């Protein structure tokens, strides 16, 4: 699969989005009356549900685009040829049919994406914003070279220029998307799905019951009718809305960057904090009614519109990225990012006392460990590979588990609670180690405090003689559970290469028990396959080494329609909210918001 066709299909999909949103973008930028907007919204929201619930044929893309082209081409001729009286009827009919056609085209275009391997939805998300910014830039550039003749309350050159631009864009898109994207060719109840997760539908409805209530009608129509703003300024408020509506959609998508770590948080908190947006309502009434001079500046209106635009595109795409995470064990969320690790060891072997400090990072998603270990007491009388079992295998929380087995581990849930691990290490023909360690969150850093006692070690043995080679290998740690202590048991024998070619066996019996009072996930028999790499950093002088660890669990060898149904429910809810958030503005007609004529 070459990338040339990848880029070509990406460009085709972007062009589809461009020509789909160009009509609305150019119909909002010339302060057209409210009735045409409400008719267009009604058509767009009435066609889409019917198109969604029933599988329509997938062959009507070029015909729909051609119909849109001829409908838009009709406007320029009709506006001059027709007298305004019958021109109104043509406007309303064209707007209704344009709404229906655009809804049908967008719905049929979205469905064809999921069938292909790559995700297409991001491409429509990009294309809509690109259309908005492109129309705004074109309008701003054209504003400085058009005579304001004001034939029927609308500009003359602006209409022709914008509509021929739209026609050229649509014809390019249709001629570019035809030679691609070929078009040849147990059950469960639904109510429990609806009542299981309703925390997203309410937010996705209430965040669009307001934005489309305000910006169409009360956004700048009332302000223009009150303060009589110059025509040269109305083209800037809508642009300041469009640009930020486009730009405030990407930051929630990416989070691995350090600065954007606090954007996608939760739903209950989102629902209880969404009431901060309701403060916007008195602001528009206040700046439309009060005549005091501090409010008669373009800057504050632009700031308010920019704030509304930024808050619209950030409380609208969040639910699409959170519900899957919270569908459902507790404790895995603390494994999503890279977690720092601090290790402190105080050991005593055959009367030799020592302290070791180590720092590093762990990545549970990759299941990899990187660590630097240094001796704070100087040089160590015993080899550090012998303490590797103390250092790294004393922390198994960062091990990568397969998604099938991910719920099995207790390490995932215990680490927020903290746990205590004991280990008995037997060296063949030598002494033994007894190690007690605790691993638990200090601040935002996982810490491991370990005390080691070494006994019965011969002075001429492989350990005290420093006969161990500088290398480490791959092994398997066998883990079973113990119900009596509500903990886990583990056995593993580590082989150590000797400089003379021989092999030293070190048996390790390990018992892990949780520290906190919360319940744990008691597993069955399984093993962890681990690979260790030792390296020396030449830039430091003290006794130090770098340890890299690759851990993977093993031992033991549908329902996507629920996610599909949830996504469809969210989309339907958002469309219903958008429809219901237009007529509500007529309620404002009761109060005499408009300023007196003088
Ligand atoms: C993201 C998305 O997904 C879907 C979809 C999902 C599943 C099935 C079928 C369709 N539609 C959209 C979408 O176009 N939103 C913006 C729409 N409008 C109305 C047009 C211009 C302004 C008002 C507005 O903001």
Numbering used by the authors: 30 to 214, 228 to 370, 372 to 600, 612 to 652
Sentences copied from the publication:
Crucially, PfENT1, a member of equilibrative nucleoside transporters (ENT, SLC29) family, shares only 17% sequence identity with the human equilibrative nucleoside transporter ENT1 (hENT1) and is unsusceptible to hENT1 inhibitors, which provides an opportunity to design inhibitors targeting PfENT1 specifically. The overall structure of PfENT1 contains eleven transmembrane (TM) helixes with pseudosymmetry.
The overall structure of PfENT1GFP presents a similar conformation as the structures of PfENT1APO and PfENT1inosine-bound. An extra density appears in the central cavity, fitting with the GSK4 molecule well. The benzene ring of GSK4 interacts with Phe139 via hydrophobic interaction. Therefore, GSK4 is an endofacial inhibitor blocking the alternating access of PfENT1.
